[PDB]
Amino acid sequence: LSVKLRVAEAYPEDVGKGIVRMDKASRAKLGVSVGDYVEVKKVLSVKLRVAEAYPEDVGKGIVRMDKASRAKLGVSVGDYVEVKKV
Template sequence: MENEKVKELVLRVAESKQRDVGRGKVRLDTEAMKALGISVGDVVEIEGKRKTAAIAWPAYAEDQGMDIIRMDGLIRKNANVGLGEKVIVRKADPKIATMVKLAPVSFTITVDPGFISFVKRRLIDTP
């Protein structure tokens, strides 16, 4: 991989390690991060059959130079890709949400202040 900055890279999807599951992280090698002009903690856009976002973290030592992106099942599902498939990765331009609406699909829920606080804590800093 070259050291010049690029707008996007094509990487092969690999399974995340257990410690990263459910954290909204993807692991990219350091050369890929440099090429995209991103740092640890930056949000990246992942485009498979659909687009999704995740937080960039450096790859494990054994993954350096392999042109892979490690992601968990939820991120793969959101991008609609499987293991071994290729995705396009680019630096995202995230905007801060001013409002989030949650709507249950098939049932009614009662919302109390404790639930609102719980949801806010879970959504803070989520891409």
Template sequence: MEITLKVNQAYPSDSGRGIARLDPDAMLRLQISPGDIIEIEGKRKTVAKVWRAPKRDWGRGIVRIDRFVRENTGVSVGDGVKVRKTDYQSARTVILAPLRKMDFRVYGMDIGDYLKHQLLKRPLVEGDLVPVIGAPALAGFGKYGQSQALLFVAVKTEPKGVVVIDESTRVIYRDRPAKGFERLGKAGVTYEDIGGLKEELQKVREIIELPLKYP
């Protein structure tokens, strides 16, 4: 079973968390519950964990996903995507590499263990852009601050297919930037990265962005 939904931007508090918000009708049609994993297909396929949408989104036929999930699917706000429930396996191994060269250090623990701690229960597929939100209490990020998303690529997973990082997963960090993923990480700052200006941002989208995209 699959349905088609229109992509909308994530709420700021959801950014970087690998989740997709669906309304109860969409979840009923897909026979899924909050916490299940869905596959999202645009130009490419990726996965996300389902959360229930707030009432103001019910009946609108939308899925709210952040810029990282949108990049992994190759879509923009307003595009249609196919959504379906998917099976998954526990990841035995996930190899992560930075999207671009960065000054990334962790104090007091292995970098792979730190990344696993930050990504526990995160679903992904090989080739995904994987954001990690900085936490200076655990790591030294050089110029990166606490709210800065550090961008990694899942260059290899074992097994293949949809996997979820759990306590048994071995996460390996490679410090050389991932090659062949230049298409990723170019979105820059988006609406869901900016909190506290919901009404103002919506007016900007309605007046400027949407008429340019859909004249």
């Protein structure tokens, strides 16, 4: 019901959309559809909408999120976060 994925930066076109990009294997483990909310956690939590991974990122075990989201969580690029369906 929860997966751990490595934080990566958002593509500029995605900045400010409140989204997390993750690949189909990750969505399948969570049972989430594109557009559903997930909770992303280190110590604190943020809720972000699921979006599809870019082809180059598929299989890397990453979640792309923008700096506002990373700042709320106190996570750096490369840190793991827990992702869970809301």
